[PDB]
């Protein structure tokens, strides 16, 4: 249970195992890693792209992108469930426990030629808590908050190198315990390195199976 409480020692141990001996601190509901510095190189003369990948257990793994206005998607799109999916009606304001969580957001890369930008791209979607997927607030941050930073940067004509990595406790868990987001703009004005805990205050999750126990 403790592994799905974002502030617990157990969670932090898993985080350390997944990212190495990088410094981290809890702030605004997330973990800032390595003083918010990433080694991503945005100063590369390469065409915008997205690359999704999977690991040896067929789980969504490291995703990379170079983002700019050529693949930005402002428009709307014109049964499948991710690994570990077990929906539960919660006792919190979200109403439900989990969302199909994209590694690389539709709005960011939906215009990239040939790419499966759908909600059922099996290399780009995980079981993600509603809280950690949806929260767009600076005070209590979710993945949406960081996606908004990247989106706003691209909308200001910035080139953003971006890397999103689901963090798993071990080789077999179906559901990641956190989402690692890294971003760097060519001009250096945008840079972050964070882990968004795959947690929700009103319940705990067994990351092995995705089974949720409401508080
Ligand atoms: Cl830039
Ligand atoms: Cl929450």
Numbering used by the authors: 40 to 117, 125 to 261
Publication text:
Because wild-type GBS_NucA is difficult to overexpress in E. coli, an inactive form of the enzyme, H148A, was used. A 1.5 Å high-resolution X-ray crystal structure of the GBS_NucA (H148A) apoprotein was obtained in space group P1 in the absence of a divalent metal. Two molecules of GBS_NucA were present in the asymmetric unit. Because the crystallization conditions lacked divalent metal ions, the active site was solvated but otherwise empty. An intricate network of putative hydrogen-bonding interactions links the metal in the active center through Asn179 to the distally located Gln180 and His142, using Asp145 as the intermediary. This network is also present in the apoprotein, where the metal-binding site is unoccupied. Given that this coil is entirely disordered in the P1 crystal form and is incomplete in molecules C and D of the P63 crystal form, we hypothesize that it is highly mobile in the absence of a DNA substrate. Residues Arg116–Asp118 along this loop form a short α-helix (henceforth referred to as α-helix S), although there are no such indications of helical propensity in Arg116–Asp118 in the P1 crystal form. The ββα motif is comprised of β-strands 7 and 8, the latter of which connects directly to α-helix C. The compact active site is outlined by this motif and its deepest recess is formed by the core β-sheet (β-strands 4, 9 and 10).
